[PDB]
Structures are given as C-alpha cells and as structure tokens.
Design a protein around this ligand. Structure first.
Ligand SMILES: *[C@@H]1O[C@H](CO)[C@@H](O[C@@H]2O[C@H](CO)[C@@H](O)[C@H](O)[C@H]2NC(C)=O)[C@H](O)[C@H]1NC(C)=O
Ligand SMILES: *[C@@H]1O[C@H](CO)[C@@H](O)[C@H](O)[C@H]1NC(C)=O
Lengths: 43, 50
C-alpha cells in the first residue's frame, strides 16, 4: 500500500488530495489530477 | 467594469468554515439536468463584480 486519494469525483473536475509514499519520500498534492479509470502504480 | 474578480452566486449547501470551492459546474436550479449548457434553470455559478 503506497498511497491514498481523497475527494468527491476523482475525475479532474474538483480538487482531490493525493498522498503517495515512495520508498523514503512522502508527497502530498492537492492538484486537479486527471486520474485513470482504475488508478494504480506499476513496478 | 472589471472582469477579473468573480464571486460564487449559487450553491446547494452552505460552505464549511475555511472551505474553498472553485468548481465551475453549471448550477441546476430545476429538476431537468444541465449538460454543461446554460439555459432555463441552468446558470453559470460565478458572476463578475464589475
Ligand atoms: C460536499 O460534497 C457532498 C457530496 O455532494 C455534499 O453533500 C450533498 O449535498 C447535497 C445538497 O447540497 C445533497 O442533496 C446531497 O444528498 C449530499 N450528498 C451527500 C453524499 O451527502 C456536501 O454538501 C458538500 N459540502 C458542502 C459544504 O456543501
Ligand atoms: C518519489 O516521487 C517524487 C515525485 O517526483 C520524486 O521527486 C522522488 O525522488 C521519488 N522518490 C523515490 C524514492 O522514488
């Protein structure tokens, strides 16, 4: 488990908090991200 | 009239303390759903102070 997404529509129409923890770097953003139909991160 | 400063004119519920809403969704005032097009009971949510 490497992150969390918080919002209402998660479709770039509203602001959605994005938290990702990659190895040693915690990243927090509140951008209007355009998310995939099924968001995931590849190895 | 200045066109750079806007204010939200319609919203279905009141804002929580320190809440920030900048969505530009067309406000549906009627029962018929707006599909991004303005019209009867479908108005733009922001207005200019002028
Ligand atoms: C935050 O978003 C939720 C989801 O849309 C809002 O809750 C809705 O409010 C409308 C009226 O404004 C109701 O008709 C819906 O039934 C509500 N849905 C849910 C799931 O509760 C909520 O009002 C928004 N926050 C603010 C401060 O407006
Ligand atoms: C985690 O992602 C951020 C965002 O680009 C990047 O700057 C950082 O180097 C990354 N860290 C690791 C360990 O991948």
């Amino acid at each position: 488990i490497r992150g969390w997404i918080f919002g209402t529509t998660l479709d770039s129409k509203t602001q959605s908090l994005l938290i990702v923890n990659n190895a040693t770097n915690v990243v927090i953003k509140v951008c209007e991200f355009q998310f995939c139909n099924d968001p995931f991160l590849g190895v | 009239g200045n066109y750079n400063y806007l204010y939200r004119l319609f919203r279905k519920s009141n804002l929580k303390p320190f809440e920030r809403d900048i969505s530009t969704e067309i406000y549906q005032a009627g029962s018929t759903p707006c599909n991004g097009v303005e019209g009867f009971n479908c108005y733009f949510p922001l207005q200019s102070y002028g």
